[PDB]
Design a protein around this motif. Structure first.
Motif, PDB file in Angstrom:
ATOM      1  N   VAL A  58       0.903  -1.163   0.000  1.00 23.37           N
ATOM      2  CA  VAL A  58       0.000   0.000   0.000  1.00 23.37           C
ATOM      3  C   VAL A  58       0.920   1.185   0.000  1.00 23.37           C
ATOM      4  CG1 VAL A  58      -0.880   1.425   1.907  1.00 23.37           C
ATOM      5  CG2 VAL A  58      -2.247  -0.439   0.984  1.00 23.37           C
ATOM      6  N   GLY A  59       2.005   1.129   0.718  1.00 19.92           N
ATOM      7  CA  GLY A  59       2.827   2.338   0.674  1.00 19.92           C
ATOM      8  C   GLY A  59       3.537   2.621  -0.625  1.00 19.92           C
ATOM      9  N   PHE A  60       4.177   1.636  -1.227  1.00 18.32           N
ATOM     10  CA  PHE A  60       5.027   2.020  -2.367  1.00 18.32           C
ATOM     11  C   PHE A  60       4.140   2.692  -3.398  1.00 18.32           C
ATOM     12  CE2 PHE A  60       5.291  -2.317  -4.446  1.00 18.32           C
ATOM     13  CZ  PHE A  60       5.128  -1.920  -5.748  1.00 18.32           C
ATOM     14  N   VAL A  61       2.956   2.167  -3.641  1.00 19.96           N
ATOM     15  CA  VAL A  61       2.015   2.820  -4.588  1.00 19.96           C
ATOM     16  C   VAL A  61       1.530   4.168  -4.057  1.00 19.96           C
ATOM     17  CG1 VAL A  61      -0.063   2.540  -5.987  1.00 19.96           C
ATOM     18  CG2 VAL A  61       1.354   0.565  -5.487  1.00 19.96           C
ATOM     19  N   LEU A  62       1.103   4.306  -2.805  1.00 17.80           N
ATOM     20  CA  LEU A  62       0.560   5.618  -2.386  1.00 17.80           C
ATOM     21  C   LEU A  62       1.692   6.518  -1.918  1.00 17.80           C
ATOM     22  CD1 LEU A  62      -2.672   5.826  -2.425  1.00 17.80           C
ATOM     23  CD2 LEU A  62      -2.350   6.646  -0.104  1.00 17.80           C
ATOM     24  N   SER A  63       2.978   6.200  -2.177  1.00 18.15           N
ATOM     25  CA  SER A  63       4.100   7.142  -1.856  1.00 18.15           C
ATOM     26  C   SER A  63       4.845   7.533  -3.111  1.00 18.15           C
ATOM     27  CB  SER A  63       5.078   6.641  -0.906  1.00 18.15           C
ATOM     28  OG  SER A  63       6.164   6.084  -1.621  1.00 18.15           O
ATOM     29  N   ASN A  64       4.502   6.931  -4.229  1.00 17.90           N
ATOM     30  CA  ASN A  64       5.075   7.434  -5.482  1.00 17.90           C
ATOM     31  C   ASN A  64       3.928   8.130  -6.182  1.00 17.90           C
ATOM     32  OD1 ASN A  64       7.360   6.067  -4.657  1.00 17.90           O
ATOM     33  ND2 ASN A  64       7.932   5.536  -6.753  1.00 17.90           N
ATOM     34  N   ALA A  65       2.735   8.105  -5.587  1.00 14.83           N
ATOM     35  CA  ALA A  65       1.587   8.824  -6.176  1.00 14.83           C
ATOM     36  C   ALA A  65       1.216  10.073  -5.399  1.00 14.83           C
ATOM     37  CB  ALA A  65       0.408   7.934  -6.284  1.00 14.83           C
ATOM     38  N   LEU A  66       1.865  10.365  -4.281  1.00 16.02           N
ATOM     39  CA  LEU A  66       1.628  11.643  -3.578  1.00 16.02           C
ATOM     40  C   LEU A  66       2.717  12.563  -4.099  1.00 16.02           C
ATOM     41  CD1 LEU A  66       0.617  11.032   0.125  1.00 16.02           C
ATOM     42  CD2 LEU A  66      -0.578  12.312  -1.624  1.00 16.02           C
ATOM     43  N   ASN A  67       3.399  12.150  -5.172  1.00 16.23           N
ATOM     44  CA  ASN A  67       4.500  12.942  -5.793  1.00 16.23           C
ATOM     45  C   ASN A  67       4.158  13.313  -7.238  1.00 16.23           C
ATOM     46  OD1 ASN A  67       7.426  12.182  -7.539  1.00 16.23           O
ATOM     47  ND2 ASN A  67       5.688  10.802  -7.726  1.00 16.23           N
ATOM     48  N   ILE A  68       3.191  12.638  -7.840  1.00 24.03           N
ATOM     49  CA  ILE A  68       2.890  12.915  -9.261  1.00 24.03           C
ATOM     50  C   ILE A  68       2.512  14.370  -9.290  1.00 24.03           C
ATOM     51  CG2 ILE A  68       0.748  12.855 -10.585  1.00 24.03           C
ATOM     52  CD1 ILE A  68       1.191   9.992 -11.169  1.00 24.03           C
ATOM     53  N   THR A  69       1.843  14.863  -8.265  1.00 26.42           N
ATOM     54  CA  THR A  69       1.384  16.264  -8.380  1.00 26.42           C
ATOM     55  C   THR A  69       2.614  17.102  -8.701  1.00 26.42           C
ATOM     56  OG1 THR A  69      -0.513  16.272  -6.952  1.00 26.42           O
ATOM     57  CG2 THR A  69       0.764  18.302  -6.985  1.00 26.42           C
ATOM     58  N   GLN A  70       3.734  16.842  -8.028  1.00 28.38           N
ATOM     59  CA  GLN A  70       4.945  17.679  -8.243  1.00 28.38           C
ATOM     60  C   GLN A  70       5.569  17.515  -9.639  1.00 28.38           C
ATOM     61  OE1 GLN A  70       4.143  16.168  -5.325  1.00 28.38           O
ATOM     62  NE2 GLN A  70       4.565  17.572  -3.638  1.00 28.38           N
ATOM     63  N   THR A  71       5.808  16.299 -10.103  1.00 23.42           N
ATOM     64  CA  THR A  71       6.498  16.146 -11.394  1.00 23.42           C
ATOM     65  C   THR A  71       5.606  16.722 -12.465  1.00 23.42           C
ATOM     66  OG1 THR A  71       7.857  14.299 -10.916  1.00 23.42           O
ATOM     67  CG2 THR A  71       7.173  14.489 -13.194  1.00 23.42           C
ATOM     68  N   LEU A  72       4.306  16.527 -12.357  1.00 23.33           N
ATOM     69  CA  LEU A  72       3.450  16.971 -13.476  1.00 23.33           C
ATOM     70  C   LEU A  72       3.683  18.464 -13.656  1.00 23.33           C
ATOM     71  CD1 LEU A  72      -0.065  15.315 -13.706  1.00 23.33           C
ATOM     72  CD2 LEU A  72       1.612  15.777 -15.494  1.00 23.33           C
ATOM     73  N   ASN A  73       3.918  19.182 -12.558  1.00 21.07           N
ATOM     74  CA  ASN A  73       4.107  20.659 -12.649  1.00 21.07           C
ATOM     75  C   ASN A  73       5.326  21.024 -13.519  1.00 21.07           C
ATOM     76  OD1 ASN A  73       2.758  21.572  -9.359  1.00 21.07           O
ATOM     77  ND2 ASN A  73       1.763  21.198 -11.325  1.00 21.07           N
ATOM     78  N   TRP A  74       6.419  20.298 -13.376  1.00 27.07           N
ATOM     79  CA  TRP A  74       7.657  20.649 -14.086  1.00 27.07           C
ATOM     80  C   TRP A  74       7.566  20.082 -15.485  1.00 27.07           C
ATOM     81  CZ3 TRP A  74       7.297  21.662  -9.284  1.00 27.07           C
ATOM     82  CH2 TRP A  74       8.319  22.225  -8.524  1.00 27.07           C
ATOM     83  N   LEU A  75       6.422  19.545 -15.902  1.00 22.37           N
ATOM     84  CA  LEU A  75       6.438  18.896 -17.250  1.00 22.37           C
ATOM     85  C   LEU A  75       5.945  19.784 -18.408  1.00 22.37           C
ATOM     86  CD1 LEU A  75       7.074  16.512 -18.962  1.00 22.37           C
ATOM     87  CD2 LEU A  75       4.914  15.462 -18.308  1.00 22.37           C
ATOM     88  N   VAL A  76       4.777  20.419 -18.292  1.00 25.48           N
ATOM     89  CA  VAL A  76       4.250  21.223 -19.435  1.00 25.48           C
ATOM     90  C   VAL A  76       5.154  22.434 -19.611  1.00 25.48           C
ATOM     91  CG1 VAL A  76       2.245  22.212 -20.587  1.00 25.48           C
ATOM     92  CG2 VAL A  76       1.937  20.438 -18.878  1.00 25.48           C
ATOM     93  N   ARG A  77       5.648  23.005 -18.512  1.00 23.05           N
ATOM     94  CA  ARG A  77       6.616  24.120 -18.646  1.00 23.05           C
ATOM     95  C   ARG A  77       7.747  23.561 -19.518  1.00 23.05           C
ATOM     96  NH1 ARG A  77       9.071  25.730 -12.940  1.00 23.05           N
ATOM     97  NH2 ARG A  77       6.798  25.666 -12.720  1.00 23.05           N
ATOM     98  N   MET A  78       8.161  22.312 -19.265  1.00 19.67           N
ATOM     99  CA  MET A  78       9.230  21.669 -20.068  1.00 19.67           C
ATOM    100  C   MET A  78       8.773  21.424 -21.504  1.00 19.67           C
ATOM    101  SD  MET A  78      11.585  21.117 -17.742  1.00 19.67           S
ATOM    102  CE  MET A  78      13.044  21.959 -18.351  1.00 19.67           C
ATOM    103  N   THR A  79       7.601  20.839 -21.719  1.00 18.13           N
ATOM    104  CA  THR A  79       7.256  20.545 -23.132  1.00 18.13           C
ATOM    105  C   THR A  79       7.021  21.853 -23.862  1.00 18.13           C
ATOM    106  OG1 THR A  79       5.846  18.871 -22.172  1.00 18.13           O
ATOM    107  CG2 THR A  79       5.862  19.009 -24.591  1.00 18.13           C
ATOM    108  N   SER A  80       6.352  22.792 -23.201  1.00 18.76           N
ATOM    109  CA  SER A  80       5.985  24.065 -23.859  1.00 18.76           C
ATOM    110  C   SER A  80       7.236  24.844 -24.253  1.00 18.76           C
ATOM    111  CB  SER A  80       5.092  24.867 -22.978  1.00 18.76           C
ATOM    112  OG  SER A  80       4.836  26.143 -23.545  1.00 18.76           O
TER     113      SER A  80
END
Length: 996
Positions: A969-991
């Motif tokens: 339960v942790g490995f999945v819900l501890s690499n998914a309380l981080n997607i919010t952060q990476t997603l932020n640095w992504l469109v700025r990157m693609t754009s």
């Protein structure tokens, strides 16, 4: 209040088993007293604020009535509730008192929801914050009375169908009255939709939905962009910076000069610009810090709830209620954050744009009034910079200002949390991260853990790594990748500021021009007079001109004849006010027209300049064009009047200057060397045409400096200039006949893929892919080590076994890095996107590793991210070309005003020139407030996609809790309380690549 309901209030046993239910008296006492309170106590304020600001009523519209009837029907369901509770009055029971009032105060509360809905008829934002939260706080305290009520009826007890049905229907449309408030008020008159949106289109920034759509369909134009609201217009802003600037500049001056004398009781004010901007924007900073504090406090809830779910998932014994009051309590605290952070973000970006505009405008305004001695230090390029670079860098600092107070509360609190779990070994990790601040950011996540963890168990013999202490510490560490990263640029930006808050404390603080010596006059019998005064070009040197006492009667062409270097040029400059006053006074009559000596043609087309601010009357425009002989010249020019003098010939620039003043037809033509290079024939007529007895200005009073005597005979009253004083005054013939000084004066007669190579790329791809598996490799191991915690607690772990656990996890730390170094080494605009892309995908593959069901719901979230990004890249791309389009014009005009300050202060057209900038800046503000809103939009949507992956992944775990593990339960819900952060640095990157 036990007797009040006659029923239990907080018996704890109620929550001690499956079928855990809050006691009814509470569900109807502190779960209804909380919303009604918000309205009944805070509203009297919001009743008057609209009242004082009362205006013309807007039209009645159905939504306004539908909203004012549904609260009304609810007055009827409430009324009938009391009615029956009251009609079967003889039930032989003293009515439980709670029975009567919950409906009674409902009646009054709903009648008050009426006036408040009515008052909002009179306002720009119809659905406010007050009546958009009175619902969000009584349709969420309700679910507790609604879950209980359905339960009893399901169990077959049918004791009360009155309360049950009435309450169902009452909650029934509160999910609707609110659904109506948000429908954007449809008034369309406001050009800016923003001042008309409901609280829930501002907090989700969808009022900007239209522009986004308009952009995808066709090319955007400056007009589509809307209008900046009045509180950001250049005129309003400058007025507020000025009152504060003046109060501080002077108080700082007094202290500096006074304390200088006080040094013996028997410079430039040290500081004010930073202090002054603050006294002005006082409240876009006491309502922008408070959101940041709540943004942090909520930030620290999610990682202290990746421990409650892990603890229940480990014991299949714990009640199933815990699992569903956690995955929901995480969404309520991921959206509350996403909204707060983005909102505070726009507030501070807006503070930034406002300060830039105010400073730029004040730097311009001041230019029109700075003492000439002061203007000497700068050059054309350095005068503009006080606008282009120094204001912009007082713009970028305000955006990062609140990082200083917060970034130490996101590094002290993250340490108190990690150490409360792993141990005093925590400081070690902060030590590696701290050595990191002075790719490295990408690598730290892998490393910090290997260091804190390996040491944790090894340092001591009584501690082992559980999963309530390892997948929580990873999250706590990640919430500190950010503050450390912003400390390097931030102390550089808050130190570039000291150069600008000083340079702009010099232009804005400089000495003014002094005009006591020249006094403008309309009654001098002689049109122009000199009072034996003296004026000095240098600050205090012997005056170039002194003791000149010549008064000129109107309508006389005076030629200030002088041998070269005799002080002639200065006389003209003097009357305007350019040189300092050694002594005496000079008086001039009426307006003036300083045709200059050096050419100042303003950018634009020739015809516009000759007007310099008047209508196309052929009687004068043609005659002034005609006499000044610009006529043959215009015909030679390629495009006619529209030809733009960005191509002018030297002789021609001279000609426009004369006409530019001939048209204004002002009273005194102070002219200096006007016919510097005109061929004599044109000049001969010009002297008559506009400055002599036969010509357009035959009446006008003119003074002409002459170093050429070609038209000398008809000069009406020639004056010979001695060094500093006027040698003699006489008519031409009288001086010639005398032949004394004059005889002597007369005597001196897939495409890119190919460029790397697809096979180089196939290898680059083979190099790139394993990096993802490695991530999966270490995380899986920590699941394994934390797995051993159950097996070895009595007595202890085999020493070989811990030595195995540190070792492979150690290799995994090194390999991900070794691959990461090889991957990065074998410009980076492409590299960052792929590493980020796989990383969210890495979180995703694992999510499938524990529940296969997610694969069905990944593609639905996956299209939303393709879409919110596909549109925002287009609209934002075209809302920035425009930003540059508008900036260069404002950064230029400041050049044209400065290089030309001598004529603008002679023709007296200052105020038009000042407002030719308030417009040029305001058109650039609209392109920046749009770009900013666009980025504060793509965020609220991309955070929903992300908070969704946590909620939908957490639920699959609470449902399938009998098959899943206690730390998976942790490995999945501890690499998914981080997607919010990476997603932020992504469109700025693609754009950014999208810009390439």
């Amino acid at each position: 209040l036990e007797k009040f309901c006659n029923s239990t209030f907080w018996n704890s046993s109620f929550l001690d088993s499956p079928e855990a239910d809050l006691p009814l008296c509470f569900e109807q006492t502190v779960l209804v007293w909380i919303p009604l309170g918000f309205l009944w106590l805070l509203a009297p304020w919001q009743l008057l604020h609209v009242y004082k600001s009362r205006t013309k009523r807007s039209s009645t519209t159905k939504l306004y009535l539908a909203k004012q009837v549904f609260v009304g029907f609810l007055l009827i369901l409430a009324a009938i509730e009391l009615a029956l509770v009251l009609t079967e009055d003889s039930g032989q029971a003293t009515v439980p008192a709670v029975r009567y009032t919950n409906p009674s105060l409902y009646l009054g509360t709903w009648l008050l929801v009426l006036l408040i809905q009515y008052s909002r008829q009179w306002c720009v934002q119809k659905n406010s914050w007050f009546l958009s939260l009175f619902w969000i706080l009584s349709i969420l305290c309700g679910t507790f009375q609604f879950q209980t009520l359905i339960r009893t009826l399901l169990q077959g007890d049918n004791s009360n169908l009155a309360y049950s049905c009435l309450f169902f229907i009452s909650y029934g449309f509160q999910i609707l009255i609110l659904i109506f408030s948000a429908f954007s008020e449809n008034n369309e008159s406001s050009n800016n939709p923003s001042s008309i949106a409901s609280f829930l289109s501002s907090i989700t920034y969808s009022w900007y939905d239209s522009i986004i759509l308009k952009g995808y369909k066709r090319p955007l134009t400056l007009e589509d962009v809307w209008e900046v609201d009045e509180e950001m217009k250049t005129k309003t802003l400058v007025s507020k910076f000025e009152t504060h600037m003046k109060r501080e500049l002077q108080k700082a001056r007094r202290a500096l000069q006074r304390r200088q004398e006080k040094s013996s009781q028997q410079d430039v004010p040290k500081s004010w610009l930073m202090k002054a901007l603050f006294k002005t924007f006082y409240m876009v900073l006491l309502k922008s810090f408070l959101l940041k504090l709540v943004n942090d406090i909520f930030t620290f809830v999610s990682p202290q709830l990746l421990k409650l779910l892990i603890s229940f998932a480990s014991d299949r014994d714990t009640y199933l209620w815990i699992g569903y009051l956690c995955a929901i309590l995480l969404f309520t605290a991921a959206l509350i954050q996403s909204f707060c952070l983005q909102c505070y973000f726009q507030l501070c970006f807006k503070l930034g744009v406002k300060v830039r505009t105010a400073i730029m405008a004040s730097v311009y305004k001041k230019a029109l009034t700075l003492s000439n001695l002061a203007r000497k230090e700068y050059t054309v390029g350095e005068t503009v910079n006080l606008m282009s670079v120094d204001a912009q860098k007082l713009m970028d600092v305000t955006n990062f200002m609140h990082m200083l107070w917060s970034s130490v509360l996101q590094i002290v609190l993250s340490i108190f949390f990690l150490w409360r779990e792993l141990g005093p070994s925590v400081l070690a990790g902060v030590g590696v991260m701290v050595l990191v601040i002075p790719f490295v950011f990408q690598l730290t996540p892998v490393l910090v853990s290997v260091v804190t963890f390996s040491v944790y168990v090894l340092v001591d013999s009584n501690n082992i790594l559980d999963a309530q202490k390892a997948f929580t510490s990873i999250t706590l560490f990640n919430i500190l990748r950010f503050p450390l990263s912003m400390l390097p640029m931030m102390i550089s930006s808050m130190l570039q500021a000291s150069v600008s808050t000083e340079r702009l404390e010099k232009y804005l603080g400089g000495d003014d021009l002094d005009t006591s010596a020249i006094r403008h006059d309309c009654n001098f019998d002689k049109a122009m007079q000199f009072s034996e005064a003296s004026f000095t070009w240098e600050h205090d040197s012997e005056a170039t001109v002194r003791d000149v006492n010549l008064d000129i009667m109107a309508g006389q062409l005076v030629a200030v004849i002088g041998p070269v270097g005799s002080g002639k040029s200065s006389l003209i400059s003097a009357m305007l006010g350019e040189m300092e006053n050694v002594h005496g006074h000079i008086t001039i009559k009426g307006t003036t027209a300083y045709v200059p000596q050096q050419s100042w043609i303003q950018n634009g087309t020739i015809k516009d300049n000759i007007l310099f601010g008047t209508e196309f009357n052929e009687k004068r425009y043609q005659q002034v064009l005609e006499a000044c002989a610009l006529l043959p010249d215009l015909e030679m020019l390629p495009g006619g009047d529209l030809a733009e003098i960005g191509n002018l010939s030297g002789g021609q620039k001279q000609r426009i200057s004369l006409a530019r003043a001939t048209y204004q037809n002002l009273d005194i033509y102070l002219l200096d060397d006007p016919l510097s290079a005109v061929d004599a024939h044109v000049g001969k007529h010009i002297f008559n045409k506009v400055l002599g007895p036969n010509g357009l200005l035959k009446g006008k009073t003119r003074l002409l400096v002459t170093h050429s005597m070609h038209f000398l005979p008809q000069v009406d009253e020639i004056v010979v200039l001695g060094n500093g004083t006027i040698v003699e005054k006489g008519s031409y013939s009288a001086l010639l006949a005398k032949k004394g000084e004059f005889a002597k004066n007369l005597k001196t007669f897939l495409e890119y893929l190919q460029a790397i190579g697809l096979f180089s790329i196939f290898f680059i791809i083979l190099a790139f892919v394993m990096n993802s598996v490695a991530f999966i490799g270490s995380n899986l191991w920590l699941s394994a080590w934390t797995s051993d915690s159950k097996i070895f607690n009595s007595t202890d772990y085999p020493a070989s076994q811990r030595d195995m656990r540190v070792g492979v996890y150690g290799a995994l730390g090194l390999a991900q890095g070794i691959f990461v170094f090889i991957a990065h080494f074998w410009p980076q605009s492409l590299r960052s996107w792929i590493t980020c892309f796989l990383g969210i995908i890495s979180t995703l593959v694992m999510i499938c590793m524990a529940t296969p069901v997610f694969t069905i719901i990944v593609i639905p979230l996956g299209i939303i991210y393709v879409s919110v990004q596909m549109f925002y890249v287009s609209t934002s791309r075209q809302l920035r070309r425009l930003d540059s389009v508008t900036r260069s014009p404002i950064y230029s005009h400041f050049s044209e005003t400065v290089s030309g300050l001598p004529v603008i202060r002679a023709f007296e057209h200052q105020q038009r020139f000042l407002k030719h900038n308030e417009v040029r800046i305001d058109t650039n503000q609209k392109c920046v407030f749009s770009w900013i809103t666009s980025n504060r939009w793509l965020a609220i949507r991309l955070e929903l996609v992300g908070n969704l992956t946590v909620f939908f992944s957490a639920l699959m775990m609470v449902i399938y809790r009998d098959t899943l593990s206690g730390d998976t339960v942790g490995f999945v819900l501890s690499n998914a309380l981080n997607i919010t952060q990476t997603l932020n640095w992504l469109v700025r990157m693609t754009s950014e690549i999208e810009t390439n």
